[PDB]
Amino acid sequence: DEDETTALVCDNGSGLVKAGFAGDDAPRAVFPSIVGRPRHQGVMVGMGQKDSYVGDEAQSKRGILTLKYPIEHGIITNWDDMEKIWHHTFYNELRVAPEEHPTLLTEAPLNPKANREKMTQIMFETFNVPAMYVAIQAVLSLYASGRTTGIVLDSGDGVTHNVPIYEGYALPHAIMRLDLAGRDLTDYLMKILTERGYSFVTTAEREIVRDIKEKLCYVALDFENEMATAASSSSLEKSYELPDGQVITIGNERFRCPETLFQPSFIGMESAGIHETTYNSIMKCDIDIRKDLYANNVMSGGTTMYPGIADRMQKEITALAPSTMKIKIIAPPERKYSVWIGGSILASLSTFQQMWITKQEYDEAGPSIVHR
Amino acid sequence: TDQQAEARAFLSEEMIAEFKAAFDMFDADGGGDISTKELGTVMRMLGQNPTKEELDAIIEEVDEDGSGTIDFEEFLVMMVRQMKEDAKGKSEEELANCFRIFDKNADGFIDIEELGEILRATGEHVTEEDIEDLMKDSDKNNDGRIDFDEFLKMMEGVQ
Amino acid sequence: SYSSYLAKADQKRGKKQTARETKKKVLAERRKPLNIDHLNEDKLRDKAKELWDWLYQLQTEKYDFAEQIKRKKYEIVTLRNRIDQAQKHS
Amino acid sequence: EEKKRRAATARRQHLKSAMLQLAVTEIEKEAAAKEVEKQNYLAEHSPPLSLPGSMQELQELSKKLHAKIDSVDEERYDTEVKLQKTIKELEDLSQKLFDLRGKFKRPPLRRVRMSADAMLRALLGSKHKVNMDLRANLKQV
Numbered sequence: 001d002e003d004e005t006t007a008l009v010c011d012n013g014s015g016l017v018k019a020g021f022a023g024d025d026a027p028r029a030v031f032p033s034i035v036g037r038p039r040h041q042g043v044m045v046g047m048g049q050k051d052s053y054v055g056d057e058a059q060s061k062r063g064i065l066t067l068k069y070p071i072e073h074g075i076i077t078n079w080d081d082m083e084k085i086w087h088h089t090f091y092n093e094l095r096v097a098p099e100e101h102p103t104l105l106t107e108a109p110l111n112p113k114a115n116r117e118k119m120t121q122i123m124f125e126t127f128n129v130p131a132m133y134v135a136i137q138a139v140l141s142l143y144a145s146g147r148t149t150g151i152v153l154d155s156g157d158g159v160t161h162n163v164p165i166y167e168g169y170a171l172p173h174a175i176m177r178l179d180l181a182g183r184d185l186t187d188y189l190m191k192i193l194t195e196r197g198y199s200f201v202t203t204a205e206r207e208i209v210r211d212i213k214e215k216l217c218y219v220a221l222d223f224e225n226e227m228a229t230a231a232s233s234s235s236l237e238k239s240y241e242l243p244d245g246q247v248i249t250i251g252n253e254r255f256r257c258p259e260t261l262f263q264p265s266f267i268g269m270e271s272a273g274i275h276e277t278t279y280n281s282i283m284k285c286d287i288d289i290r291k292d293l294y295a296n297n298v299m300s301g302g303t304t305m306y307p308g309i310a311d312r313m314q315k316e317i318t319a320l321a322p323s324t325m326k327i328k329i330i331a332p333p334e335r336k337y338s339v340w341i342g343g344s345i346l347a348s349l350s351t352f353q354q355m356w357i358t359k360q361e362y363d364e365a366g367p368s369i370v371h372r
Numbered sequence: 373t374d375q376q377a378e379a380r381a382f383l384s385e386e387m388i389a390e391f392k393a394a395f396d397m398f399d400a401d402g403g404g405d406i407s408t409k410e411l412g413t414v415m416r417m418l419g420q421n422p423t424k425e426e427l428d429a430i431i432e433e434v435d436e437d438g439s440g441t442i443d444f445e446e447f448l449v450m451m452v453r454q455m456k457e458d459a460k461g462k463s464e465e466e467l468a469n470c471f472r473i474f475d476k477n478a479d480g481f482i483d484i485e486e487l488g489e490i491l492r493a494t495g496e497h498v499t500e501e502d503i504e505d506l507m508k509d510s511d512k513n514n515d516g517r518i519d520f521d522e523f524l525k526m527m528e529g530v531q
Numbered sequence: 532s533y534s535s536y537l538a539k540a541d542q543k544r545g546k547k548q549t550a551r552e553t554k555k556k557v558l559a560e561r562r563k564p565l566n567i568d569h570l571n572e573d574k575l576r577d578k579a580k581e582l583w584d585w586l587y588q589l590q591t592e593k594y595d596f597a598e599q600i601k602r603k604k605y606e607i608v609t610l611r612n613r614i615d616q617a618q619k620h621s
Numbered sequence: 622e623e624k625k626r627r628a629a630t631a632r633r634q635h636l637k638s639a640m641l642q643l644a645v646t647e648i649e650k651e652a653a654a655k656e657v658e659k660q661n662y663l664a665e666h667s668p669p670l671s672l673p674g675s676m677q678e679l680q681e682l683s684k685k686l687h688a689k690i691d692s693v694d695e696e697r698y699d700t701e702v703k704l705q706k707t708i709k710e711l712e713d714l715s716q717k718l719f720d721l722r723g724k725f726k727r728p729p730l731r732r733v734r735m736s737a738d739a740m741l742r743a744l745l746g747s748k749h750k751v752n753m754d755l756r757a758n759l760k761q762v
């Protein structure tokens with residue numbers, strides 16, 4: 001129990017932090033990855049002067065603060081502001097004292113060696129956690145779907161990745177990163193919806209375009225004869241009621257937004273798209289392992305939640321793969337937390353105890369120890 | 373040092389006296405602190421066989437001065453935490469056992485019937501009112517029975 | 532849900548067959564033939580009992596492992612009641 | 622204003638302690654009795670051996686035993702495994718409770734290191750006189 005209860009799992013994202021206790025089924029804490037700094041001197045009624053704001057209080061009060069994102073494209077870019085988000089996570093969100101809890105953290109696919117050593121330096125030397133561990137994100141997603149070999153298409157708020165994993169070892173030279181994700185996708189909907197003849201003028205109009213994207217957006221299979229369908233004008237249309245009455249209608253654009261993930265050309269991106277990239281990762285891997293990867297395309301991440309994403313991907317890679325092959329696109333329902341759940345499982349596991357980096361290992365080996 | 377405080381506050385001269393004698397044998401050279409090696413020797417005399425990793429972890433558990441060694445102070449702290457944990461384990465074990473004795477019907481509970489029996493089984497003189505009263509006070513989830521959790525709580529203190 | 536039937540076969544048969552040989556491997560080690568046959572006459576005497584003790588040895592352990600599970604089985608019953616009691620979806 | 626109520630509580634305590642006190646003394650009864658069952662069971666399943674004559678008997682018996690050994694051993698093994706299975710089942714349950722409550726009292730597995738009382742005895746042998754438990758010490762008279 002000492003640490004059975006006690007292991008923490010913190011998944012640091014570009015848009016959201018997911019956090020909680022190893023053992024739980026889902027994150028106890030989910031909140032924006034921002035750190036707000038007040039543009040002016042003054043106070044809220046009853047509070048003192050605050051130097052900084054994090055998560056939702058930074059979002060809610062955004063009009064008087066300069067908002068900053070510590071993690072650009074999955075990589076920690078500002079370490080002063082990240083130690084601020086961690087502090088908030090332990091002390092306010094989970095309300096635990098960190099110096100008696102083992103902490104499993106996550107990093108990104110080709111996270112620079114030096115960063116994995118730096119967050120270890122900050123975990124052990126400024127938070128004084130007993131022990132910690134850094135798992136790679138795609139690797140926890142895979143594992144949370146039971147398996148050990150597969151290829152994960154991972155897509156969240158600032159990055160998309162393909163991480164081919166074989167008997168647990170993520171394959172460095174076959175990993176692909178595509179910098180277009182849910183953030184890019186909300187801003188494109190924004191324009192095709194203002195372009196539908198609308199105005200997201202006040203900040204209460206801006207924010208909810210993102211809630212339109214999440215609730216009403218679709219990834220149609222045969223996106224071709226779906227536009228064609230749009231035109232005959234079926235009961236395909238969908239009206240959402242705004243903060244007030246102002247019933248906005250979205251028929252068609254509803255799927256023009258996730259067609260951006262297959263066609264980056266919709267947004268002036270010259271890069272290849274999700275399905276081709278799944279494939280290219282795969283023809284960059286060893287030959288003998290390619291049947292395995294093909295029958296185990298595990299999807300994880302908030303942006304892979306658009307319904308019919310899996311069917312489109314299913315047919316997208318069947319038709320690029322040699323017919324002798326078995327294609328299989330696994331997309332679980334909890335996928336917006338796969339990464340986290342994979343960490344919860346792993347860290348609560350009976351056999352993981354012997355991989356925890358302890359302060360004994362650290363004080364004796366330097367940050368190098370956990371770096372592997 | 374704050375820990376080394378209550379720690380020494382906890383123990384008695386008697387305690388310290390012996391914990392010292394004990395500490396001294398840990399400390400070979402007689403310098404003033406147990407090293408990652410001085411500890412290893414005693415551990416084996418004590419019948420263990422720790423590994424470098426294991427030893428340090430055991431060391432830096434009470435090494436507040438990041439010395440990588442343990443002084444008679446950091447040591448007393450350590451003895452204390454142990455003293456604590458020991459007594460806790462012994463307690464919960466005993467109670468755990470008591471619950472099985474009182475249960476006997478093995479339904480994992482203790483119903484007003486068994487409670488009466490066991491109570492009446494004591495020498496003490498008691499009337500039904502007493503029994504049902506103790507039940508009502510103990511049964512917090514008001515389900516009639518007394519679960520192990522409740523039993524731990526109810527017996528909390530009693531000897 | 533019948534595509535999962537092939538999973539039953541593969542899984543069960545798999546694990547069960549794995550368990551078997553292990554048990555065989557394990558049990559085999561702890562076995563030293565009754566090689567000593569017609570090498571002496573009083574040998575049997577000093578031998579027979581040794582086997583006897585080994586048996587008694589095993590027997591006694593089997594009894595303990597047994598009583599143990601029972602005790603554990605009860606730990607469970609209780610540990611389950613604590614789980615339900617600690618439900619309160621409130 | 623329930624001035625007397627104080628005596629009511631003390632009673633429950635007086636009784637609770639009458640209970641525990643009862644428990645403990647019953648605890649060792651069951652314990653020893655238990656053992657008794659153990660020696661009886663063993664009493665018949667492997668009674669005070671009596672070495673036979675000399676020729677065929679000693680050999681025969683020896684063969685008899687040796688075969689039983691593989692037998693009992695297998696049983697011993699199967700049992701050990703049903704234990705493993707069990708301990709496993711409760712570890713999982715000892716989880717389904719943690720992340721639903723937190724650290725709770727009496728975990729079934731109990732990771733215990735040797736007691737300080739042990740280490741002290743082990744190291745000083747004779748001179749280790751302190752029935753340590755919790756009782757602090759403050760000047761007598």
Ligand SMILES: [Ca+2]
Pocket residue numbers: 399400401402403404405406407410
């Ligand atoms: Ca020394």
Ligand SMILES: [Ca+2]
Pocket residue numbers: 405435436437438439440441442443446
């Ligand atoms: Ca020291």
Ligand SMILES: [Ca+2]
Pocket residue numbers: 474475476477478479480481482483486
């Ligand atoms: Ca009962």
Ligand SMILES: [Ca+2]
Pocket residue numbers: 511512513514515516517518519522
């Ligand atoms: Ca109850």
